[PDB]
Structure 1
Amino acid sequence: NASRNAWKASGGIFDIPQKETRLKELERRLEDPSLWNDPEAARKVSQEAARLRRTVDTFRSLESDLQGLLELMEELPAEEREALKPELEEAAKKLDELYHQTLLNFPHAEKNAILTIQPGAGGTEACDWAEMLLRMYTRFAERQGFQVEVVDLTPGPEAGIDYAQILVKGENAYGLLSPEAGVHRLVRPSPFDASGRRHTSFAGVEVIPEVDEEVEVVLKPEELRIDVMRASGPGGQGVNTTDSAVRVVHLPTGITVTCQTTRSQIKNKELALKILKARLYELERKKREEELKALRGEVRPIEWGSQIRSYVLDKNYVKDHRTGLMRHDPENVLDGDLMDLIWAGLEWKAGRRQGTEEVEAE
């Protein structure tokens, strides 16, 4: 375990120098009264000042755990060496605190997620893999200790799955699956090829939380404006001196509907409203899906030029391309061994990527 220890120390270490200097600029800032007489200003001041709580304790606590262990650890099979080992068992649940502080920082990491597998380049073979990944991610959820609700499944032509979708019930289901989007490369002799040669195939994967609605809130009076007016066409003297035309304009969007079918202003206002609803509902509905089209913008590559992590069963080895990391047990990987992988590699990269972007050019 000496390996993952120095690793967690390395994570906390680069935090040190950066937040080291970042703290010193901020602290002498919080000294002046002129700084505080700017209320909203010294708010975000005390915010960064706050971040120095999670910064300090990690470095301090972890720094001392490295050294102390190193000493009474090197050599002994019985006495004081096994005395020092379970002192780091509590330090192992303190490694726990560290990891939780690196993952939980997603928009909706904490809530359950929704995974979807959709095959790609590779034909009948490509979809055979889609199902392999289905069981893969499914099987992982069982071990993570999570309930899997399969929302939709659709077997393909020969091999079985043109598409599939799942609901990983639990907590941090999203934060955990989050770094599993993108395509996946799969090399092997094709169980469908009459010659059996090596064939690359590609499946797609995506992931998402869950949310609410907004409909009726809009029909609130003060937002729209209703005009009356004489109708048009037939009515005789009735249509003349009887205004039964109605037009509800939805001021917030300008969108409007007008109606003058019946002879009743009340029955016409009733109708217009009932149609403005449906129109206004579709607009707001699109806007919802239009936000998910900007979540397609978060990542939405093609289908086989691009990859994320290769799985070759020939030479036995998976390879997350995002991290350079490797392995040689695609069998185990295609079963659930993801914690270690996702944890470090995926979280690290994902978080450090967007994080360093945000604090350097975003």
Structure 2
Amino acid sequence: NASRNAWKASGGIFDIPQKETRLKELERRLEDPSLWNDPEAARKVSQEAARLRRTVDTFRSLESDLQGLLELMEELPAEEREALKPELEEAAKKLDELYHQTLLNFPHAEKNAILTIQPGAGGTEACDWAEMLLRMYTRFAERQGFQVEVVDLTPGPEAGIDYAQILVKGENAYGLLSPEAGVHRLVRPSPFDASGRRHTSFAGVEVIPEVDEEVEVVLKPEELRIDVMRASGPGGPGVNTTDSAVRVVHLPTGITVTCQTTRSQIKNKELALKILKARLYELERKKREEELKALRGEVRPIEWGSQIRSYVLDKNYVKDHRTGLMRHDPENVLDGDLMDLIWAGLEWKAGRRQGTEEVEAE
């Protein structure tokens, strides 16, 4: 297990010098009496002190399992050297906590997730590749300990999928499948091509947890104003002296509506409200779109080069264009070996591009 040591060790090492200088500018700010006088402004101050716990603990735990472990173990069959191995069996136990406490910090990492696959540039082979990816994440779920349900799926003309969607249950379902965003790339001699030469094919992937609803709470009586007024058109003296028309404007949203199709004020006041309900439902569905579709991807051309990870079956090599990381087993990776990818490199760069954005300028 000496191949993942320096990876996890140095992983908690780059936070040492940076947080060292910042916590110093804060800890000395917590001294002067004039600081705490600020109401909630001072909470943001003592808050950063609540981080000197989830940083100094590694300065002690990770540093001790590096100074003591690396010593007595350089050479010996099983005497005092192999006996020092179980001494750090908890070093892999504690490795779990440092890894976890940097993934759940995502928006909704803890809850489940939905993953929709859809073919793209690459002809009918691309339509066939999508089913491969489906069968990849599917096995990756069971083997991760997750449950799976195909929420929807549609076979292609000759391939096997023009579209597919799969809800993965279990904790951190959105966390692990997060870096699976974007279009992947496939390279291999096309099984559908007569000359069988090497063709490229693409396919997009998306991930997102889940939400709820709120239909009636909107039509709170406190919000909208209701008006009464005589009706336009026929009626006799009854129409002139009896106001039955109604105008139910929604004050906040400003959207108004008027009705007077029936001789009655209540049945108009009633209808005019069922009408406002429909429009206010269609106004909540429009705003319900940006906050449930912008999370998918701010782009995703699915074209060429829009990919973030290529899988070449000719020369046998996958490659994450994000971490620059490489590999030599596309045949197994497209079966469940996503852990090696998501764990070390994927979640890293994923949180890195946002973790370097906040701790600098954003």
* Structure-1-length-normalised TM-score: 0.98
CA 1:206 to 1:252, structure 2 compared with 1: closer, same or farther past 3 Å? same
Q: Deviations over 1:109-144 (max 9, x none)?
A: 111100011000111111100000010011100100
In the TM superposition, residue 258 of structure 1 has moved relative to its aligned partner by 0.5
In the TM superposition, residue 315 of structure 1 has moved relative to its aligned partner by 0.2
Query: Is 2:300–2:306's contact at 8 Å kept on the other side of the alignment?
Result: no
SS in structure 1 at match of 2:140 = helix
SS in structure 1 at match of 2:96 = helix
Q: 1:152 and 1:293 mapped to 2: Cα distance? A: 18
CA 1:62 to 1:28, structure 2 compared with 1: closer, same or farther past 3 Å? same
Query: Is 1:120–1:304's contact at 8 Å kept on the other side of the alignment?
Result: no
CA 1:15 to 1:183, structure 2 compared with 1: closer, same or farther past 3 Å? same
What is the match of residue 257 of structure 1?
Answer: 257
In the TM superposition, residue 215 of structure 1 has moved relative to its aligned partner by 1.1
CA 1:348 to 1:15, structure 2 compared with 1: closer, same or farther past 3 Å? same
Q: 2:27 and 2:114 mapped to 1: Cα distance? A: 43
Q: 1:290 and 1:268 mapped to 2: Cα distance? A: 35
Structure 2's unaligned 5+ residue stretches are none
What is the match of residue 157 of structure 2?
Answer: 157
Q: Deviations over 1:229-264 (max 9, x none)?
A: 001011111110000000100011000110011010
SS in structure 2 at match of 1:248 = strand
In the TM superposition, residue 340 of structure 1 has moved relative to its aligned partner by 1.8
**Which has the larger displacement, 303-312 or 222-231?**
303-312
In the TM superposition, residue 292 of structure 1 has moved relative to its aligned partner by 2.6
In the TM superposition, residue 351 of structure 1 has moved relative to its aligned partner by 0.7
Q: 1:97 and 1:296 mapped to 2: Cα distance? A: 28
Over the matched positions of the two proteins, sequence identity in percent amounts to: 100
* Structure-2-length-normalised TM-score: 0.98
Q: 1:143 and 1:90 mapped to 2: Cα distance? A: 24
Q: Deviations over 1:61-95 (max 9, x none)?
A: 10111110111110001211111100110111011
Query: Is 2:230–2:240's contact at 8 Å kept on the other side of the alignment?
Result: yes
What is the match of residue 241 of structure 1?
Answer: 241
Structure 1's unaligned 5+ residue stretches are none
In the TM superposition, residue 361 of structure 1 has moved relative to its aligned partner by 1.4
What is the match of residue 139 of structure 1?
Answer: 139
Query: Is 2:182–2:297's contact at 8 Å kept on the other side of the alignment?
Result: no
Query: Is 1:204–1:303's contact at 8 Å kept on the other side of the alignment?
Result: no
In the TM superposition, residue 303 of structure 1 has moved relative to its aligned partner by 2.4
Q: CA RMSD in A?
A: 1.0
SS in structure 2 at match of 1:104 = coil
In the TM superposition, residue 299 of structure 1 has moved relative to its aligned partner by 4.2
CA 1:72 to 1:15, structure 2 compared with 1: closer, same or farther past 3 Å? same
Query: Is 1:228–1:247's contact at 8 Å kept on the other side of the alignment?
Result: yes
SS in structure 2 at match of 1:305 = coil
Q: 2:299 and 2:31 mapped to 1: Cα distance? A: 44
Query: Is 2:121–2:302's contact at 8 Å kept on the other side of the alignment?
Result: no
**Which has the larger displacement, 308-317 or 3-12?**
3-12
In the TM superposition, residue 304 of structure 1 has moved relative to its aligned partner by 2.1
SS in structure 2 at match of 1:219 = coil
Q: Deviations over 1:288-333 (max 9, x none)?
A: 1122343245443342231110000000000000001111111110
Q: Deviations over 1:18-60 (max 9, x none)?
A: 1100100000000011100112121011111111110100121
